[PDB]
Design a protein around this ligand. Structure first.
Ligand SMILES: [Mg+2]
Lengths: 95, 106, 87, 96, 96, 82, 106, 95
DNA sequence: ATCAATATCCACCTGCAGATACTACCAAAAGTGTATTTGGAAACTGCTCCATCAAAAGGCATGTTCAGCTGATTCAGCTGAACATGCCTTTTGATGGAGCAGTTTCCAAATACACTTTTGGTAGTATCTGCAGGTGGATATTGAT
DNA sequence: ATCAATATCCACCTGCAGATACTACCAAAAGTGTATTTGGAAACTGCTCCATCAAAAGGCATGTTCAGCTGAATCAGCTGAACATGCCTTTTGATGGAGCAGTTTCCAAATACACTTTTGGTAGTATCTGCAGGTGGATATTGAT
């Protein structure tokens, strides 16, 4: 009865953080789900190519970060990089 | 037993993102930081688009975001618009916009 | 078992009214009377390309049924990415 | 017996259709067109309904955008009336 | 005392440059423009001699093709003189 | 004769580009529009090539940095590697 | 020892192509025919262009093919032109073409 | 020092099959090389996607063939498929 | 018309940049053979959802009428094309040294794996609520006069 | 200006499908804690080829002049918008089964070393030639008359 995965519960968490009294339709969620898969693939792709280009075989946060600078426009990139740098910093601090 | 998401401060699921990176065949190996960073980025972005969609929801006296609110949000934001410039949001409509010369009289 | 009716000329189900609605959503005030056939022709080319590619995916997977993913993937190749249907 | 002047209903329709998001081609005719064209590529094909809906959403968005560009080509020519030459210039410039 | 009509040279130039492929911008002023621009994203920067060449081939291929579309936009407006609005329209339609 | 760099891209050379593009007659405001446009093209592309440079930890922008940038901007160029 | 190219009837390097596919992270695995097929495909396309570029050299009194010939070849063929519609051949110029309304009166 | 690979020799060989008395400049060869890599990446890329869509771990000649169909215009696709199906045959029918 | 200025052509000549050809050499592929692993076609069949087919429901086709838009015609002015007459920038080549690319080391971070815990999805039965479509009532916009 | 036909507004009002809410259940995901491998950083280094600059090379800046284009204004013919009318197709909701997708079986084909062979690239040399860039001289093209 095979199980279909989606980012819905995460999307919903985050919805609540920014607009606590606001809901989302299932059609509007399918879209948010498209959106996340989409950007995932694009960034992962950019990083894929980027590693190959530099004969690296490992995709790290450094490759993600660049992929982000390449893919996103100015302000979104700057903010996205903060959040990525700081999530990593913080995750590394569990050690 | 801490999740990696909690460890990194994130709502979005790092375990999954790691998994999905492995199975996508993007590279032989996947660094530990990668899915953390990527999950954060993805979380950031969904937060941006919900902020803005939430507002259009509110601007239209509604409480539940539908795809029109996503389309309003995306298209009225220079940068999201560009990011999503070759993308179609089903059931989004278009921005109201009438070219000047088309309007009546002077 | 018993025999699916013939399909012809369905392009004309894209009516003058319905095209005019599309033009409106697209901000258009006045419409030359030759637009309706032109539009029919341009739509037909759009669909043949999306469908060719979708059906290629269908067959590649040895199915008889064109899925929403088949179309979504074909749209992506064509640079007309669509959200809402399995993206 | 009242009469709106030419253009006035058109602007009304523009405001209306730009505020809504429902599909504008009637569903069943569109579906037939899909089946007809697919059948010419291959026979004994079936479709998920959401596949047809996907095609319609994609098709309607493409055409609406095409008319925006087309409208800009007419206006460039100092007209208010879209003509085939406008659609064709759009499609030449677009890379189609 | 002999003078070519306006447009006659334009044509001769059109034919001459369509025949050929040499680049059409002096290499040096190009080199400075590049480095000027690149400076705003990182300082103290060298460039392979081929890297600058790639960039010049691309820029010229781009601008030449933009001029074709631009020209089509002028002709569309029943003109023969390219104007800034013609370039703007072409870029708008291309999606830039 | 301290001159701006963008202006190094001169009226006649613009005029020759147009000619290759089949253009017969050219309005005087073109040369400035055309420089504006080329600047945008180059900002967009150089940014990405450099970003490739920085990634590889180089001080030298390679032809590959450029070719790769061109590629992702939809402007695939042939003849300089890759 | 016989090369796989020679087994397949081909001038293009089946082994290389195989290697390139493994190291491209296109998939976990690679079947044996795929390199063969792909290699034949690239040989074929290569030949089609050199055929037409060759002709283009002839047509200009030339025995050495240069970029210009590849460009005329490609842009004078509907199919190659489409395949390459978003590609720029360095040093290829453009096709002689002048819009008819720009011609003088005759 | 490092071995800089190209398809140049394999291109030259096919030139002589097709135009035995015609030769080629360096620049022209570089473009041909670009071209082969490009088409390679495009096809392989499309094959990868196909396999992923159908949850397969292997890129076979079937994937390459469908890939070809998806990428090439009509007539070109046709001849390419035949050339591929052919070369696979000679290869199997050959110890 | 003719007539003359200038562009364009075709044939022939040549020097050397760019291409072919050499060989040697040698590392790193590509081929081979053996041992091991696993992906995915096949056979079988549970179960979704597609094609198909009546009962409800609002959009389409056509002809008539005329408002006003397009496109043809005219015309004056200003704006680019052409070209002379100076100005000065770019291109070409030579020559140190910055940095890129080669290479080797060794360890922090990777994959591998087994085993234990947690989670996110689904299913089933639950009751919960935003807003669309309806209502009516006050106001706005349009177009004739 | 005024009047009046009709769209537009907005506000609140009822029905219900779509959302939310819940407990029960589990497979697969994800975390944890070992054993084992290595990718790529670090640090030193040889050698391109890049920035620099001086000598040689020709293109671009300017101003004057006027041909001919763009755009304004005027007009008529005619195309396309609006609307009244009559006819029926699309939308929507309920069953029977075609095909897709979830199992399990298993072998033909894949990976994984290790091992032998070869070929494609580079470097050192020498060797060669297609054709760009002169040439002259004939003829076409353009533009004035
Ligand atoms: Mg048919």
């Amino acid at each position: 009865k095979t199980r279909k995965e989606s980012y819905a519960i995460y999307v919903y968490k985050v919805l609540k953080q920014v607009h606590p009294d606001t809901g989302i339709s299932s059609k509007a969620m399918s879209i948010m789900n498209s959106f996340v898969n989409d950007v995932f693939e694009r960034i992962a792709g950019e990083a894929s190519r980027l590693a190959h280009y530099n004969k690296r075989s490992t995709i790290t946060s450094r490759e993600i970060q660049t992929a982000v600078r390449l893919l996103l426009p100015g302000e979104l990139a700057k903010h996205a990089v903060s959040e990525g740098t700081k999530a990593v910093t913080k995750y590394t601090s569990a050690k | 037993a801490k999740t990696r998401s909690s460890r990194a401060g994130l709502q979005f699921p790092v375990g999954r993102v790691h998994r999905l990176l492995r199975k996508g065949n993007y590279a032989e190996r996947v660094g530990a930081g990668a899915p953390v960073y990527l999950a954060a980025v993805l979380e950031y972005l969904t937060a941006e688009i919900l902020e803005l969609a939430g507002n259009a929801a509110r601007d239209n006296k509604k409480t539940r975001i539908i795809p029109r609110h996503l389309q309003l949000a995306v298209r009225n934001d220079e940068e999201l618009n560009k990011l999503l410039g070759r993308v179609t949001i089903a059931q989004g409509g278009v921005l109201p916009n009438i070219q000047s010369v088309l309007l009546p009289k002077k | 078992k018993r025999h699916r009716k013939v399909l012809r000329d369905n392009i004309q189900g894209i009516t003058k009214p319905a095209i005019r609605r599309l033009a409106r959503r697209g901000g258009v005030k006045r419409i030359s009377g030759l637009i309706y056939e032109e539009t029919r022709g341009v739509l037909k080319v759009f669909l043949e390309n999306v469908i060719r590619d979708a059906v290629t995916y269908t067959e590649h997977a040895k199915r008889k049924t064109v899925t929403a993913m088949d179309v979504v993937y074909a749209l992506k190749r064509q640079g007309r990415t669509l959200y809402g249907f399995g993206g | 017996p009242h009469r709106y002047r030419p253009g006035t209903v058109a602007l009304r329709e523009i405001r209306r259709y730009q505020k809504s998001t429902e599909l504008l081609i009637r569903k069943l005719p569109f579906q037939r067109l899909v089946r007809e064209i697919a059948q010419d590529f291959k026979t004994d094909l079936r479709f998920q309904s959401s596949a047809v809906m996907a095609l319609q959403e994609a098709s309607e968005a493409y055409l609406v955008a095409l008319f925006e560009d087309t409208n800009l080509c007419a206006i460039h020519a100092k007209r208010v009336t879209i003509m085939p030459k406008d659609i064709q210039l759009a499609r030449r410039i677009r890379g189609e």
